[PDB]
Ligand binder design. Structure first.
Ligand code: 01K
Ligand code: ZN
Ligand code: ZN
Ligand code: ZN
Ligand code: ZN
Length: 533
């Protein structure tokens, strides 16, 4: 097997000895923490015969020092990988409450502290040994790319290189300043996903708000509707035969589902921090579902900058959605407030281990405070829970309460099969909401076109793809990377591909004169703004 790269970077052994030794030096000054590591583990003095069955590749400061002093490391990544193996042997063998498990953890604290800057000034990205979180002995490792002009291996996630965007391979930042070239634009941005009237409304609401209270670190927000499609919820068999042969209510119930996502710019790159999936039941839907919206589910990653404003803008998103559907025809929404189960993630693949998922009362009062802001906001004219809304809007049978896809009531009515029910309504009353947009006739019209995009049809597609491809949202850097790859997924697996149209003639034109500041204004030659060809 024969390989090449004609002007690689190799480090003279005294070079990387001089660069790396201060970091080992640090590890060594940690007394006593470093003491069980200055020499190899001797199971004869410790009385642990099983050790070399558990730890197959021992490593210790003295071995790394000997390797360093005799130039056995040709690239700093081998140095780094050796000391991480030492730490990983420490963590693997000893219980997480061990004394030397703790020692190990502190040594790792300070080796992280020291290795990032030196590795950086040796051209590389960090000095970390990274691994993806497990699924279902093995772990999958983080990916690397090798710079094309210098050969310095770097964490793909760290430097955010994706071949599909820059198909000529990867070249580092320094190898570019060395050639005076600037970086090539990521066209596959959140901003440049298809913009749409709904998403524009939400993003305008929160952008004005975060200007209103402006922390200097907050960045631009982009809301975007990434899929939209006409589905119908089929009525479950028992529940169906007691009311459809009757003819009281319909076989199916037609709605439009929309998946919509929010991105913030953080360190100059989009970081997708919020997602939502709604079912909207139009004016032509047979009752009970007529003119109702329902948020099928919500999800969030807490890396919004600044975490102070986090919740305020989650709320401004939700209430902007209520405002928008209000304005064009719907009259009641519905927020079943159910906490994320198990280790089940709603919309985003792998959540940050330090992001606490609420218990239902936290959840219920969060929804309640968002709703209160909406009431005060002139926007929603009232709201109350499902029980006090089912007996105030007096109701005697089951085909009278909305019947949504994947909702709880459909399934519990279904299993009330062997017949009580009217009373379970207010056991779970504070988790199910009812939301009145109007106080109080012309039909709904959705300006926004359909967006066929299977990855965002429902929620299983995107989670599955992300679990495969390891797009986790567990780190700000992993989130950055997963946002990147998800955006080029949305951009290049456009199940819609466009039949452009000009705007003064409503024609269908191959060559057109786009406008720069209009959101989509083209003109077939055959006007105010600066048009470009
Ligand atoms: C059968 C089946 O599967 N069926 C289902 C059917 C679908 C159900 C449909 N229903 C829904 O869609 C219901 S709404 C969506 C529920 N899902 C989630 O919420 C996902 C995870 N959570 C979040 O994204 C967020 O919490 C969010 C609610 C979006 C906003 O959070 P936040 O940032 O505004 O504040 P915080 O998180 O409440 O907490 C804010 C403070 O609370 C703290 N905190 C939170 N939780 C806890 C806790 N448990 N213990 C202690 N402290 C705790 C936290 O430290 C923090 O502190 P600080 O502000 O000082 O830093 C299926 N289809 O899978
Ligand atoms: Zn790195
Ligand atoms: Zn380079
Ligand atoms: Zn024309
Ligand atoms: Zn224009």
């Amino acid at each position: 097997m024969g390989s090449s790269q004609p002007r690689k970077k190799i480090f003279k052994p005294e070079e990387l000895r001089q660069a790396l030794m201060p970091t080992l030096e640090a590890l060594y000054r940690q007394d006593p923490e470093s003491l069980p590591f200055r020499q190899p583990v001797d199971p004869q003095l410790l009385g642990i015969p099983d050790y070399f069955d558990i730890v197959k590749n021992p490593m210790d400061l003295s071995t790394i020092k000997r390797k360093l002093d005799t130039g056995q490391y040709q690239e700093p990544w081998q140095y780094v990988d050796d000391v991480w193996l030492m730490f990983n042997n420490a963590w693997l063998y000893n219980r997480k409450t061990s004394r030397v498990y703790k020692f190990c953890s502190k040594l790792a604290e300070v080796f992280e502290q020291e290795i990032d800057p030196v590795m950086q000034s040796l051209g590389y990205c960090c000095g970390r040994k990274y691994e993806f979180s497990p699924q279902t002995d093995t772990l999958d490792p983080e990916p690397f790319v090798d710079c094309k002009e210098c050969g310095r291996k770097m964490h793909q996630i760290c430097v955010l290189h994706y071949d599909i965007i820059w198909p000529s391979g990867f070249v580092c930042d320094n190898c570019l300043k060395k050639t005076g070239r600037p970086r090539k634009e990521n066209k596959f941005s959140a901003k440049r996903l298809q913009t749409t009237r709904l998403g524009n409304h939400l993003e305008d609401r929160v952008n004005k708000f975060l200007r209103r209270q402006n922390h200097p670190e907050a960045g631009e927000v982009f809301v975007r509707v990434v899929a939209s499609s006409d589905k119908t919820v089929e009525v479950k068999p028992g529940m169906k035969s007691r009311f459809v042969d009757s003819g009281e209510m319909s076989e199916s119930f037609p709605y439009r589902t929309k998946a919509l996502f929010a991105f913030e710019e953080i360190d100059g790159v989009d970081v997708c921090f919020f997602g939502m999936h709604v079912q909207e039941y139009g004016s032509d839907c047979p009752p009970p579902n007529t003119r109702r919206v329902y948020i099928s589910y919500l999800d969030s990653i807490h890396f919004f900058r600044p975490r102070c404003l986090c919740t305020a803008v989650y709320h401004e998103i939700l209430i902007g959605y209520l405002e928008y559907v209000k304005k064009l025809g719907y009259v009641t929404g519905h927020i079943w407030a159910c906490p994320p189960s198990e280790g089940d993630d709603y919309i985003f693949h792998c959540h940050p281990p330090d992001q606490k998922i609420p218990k239902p009362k936290r959840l219920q009062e969060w929804f309640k405070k968002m709703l209160d802001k909406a009431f005060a906001e002139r926007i929603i004219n009232d709201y109350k829970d499902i029980f006090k809304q089912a007996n105030e809007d007096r109701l005697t049978s089951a085909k009278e309460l909305p019947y949504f896809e994947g909702d709880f009531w459909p399934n519990v009515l279904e299993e009330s099969i062997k017949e009580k029910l009217y009373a379970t309504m207010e056991k779970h009353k504070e988790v199910f909401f009812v939301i009145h947009l109007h106080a109080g006739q012309p039909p709904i019209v959705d300006p926004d076109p359909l967006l066929s995009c299977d990855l965002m049809d429902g929620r299983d597609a995107f989670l599955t793809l992300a679990r495969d491809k390891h797009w986790e949202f567990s780190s700000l850097r992993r989130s950055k990377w997963s946002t990147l790859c998800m955006l080029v997924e949305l951009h290049t697996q456009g199940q819609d591909r466009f039949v452009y149209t000009c705007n003064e003639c409503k024609h269908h034109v191959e060559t057109r004169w786009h406008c720069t500041v209009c959101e989509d204004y083209d003109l077939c030659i055959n006007h105010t703004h600066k048009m470009v060809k």
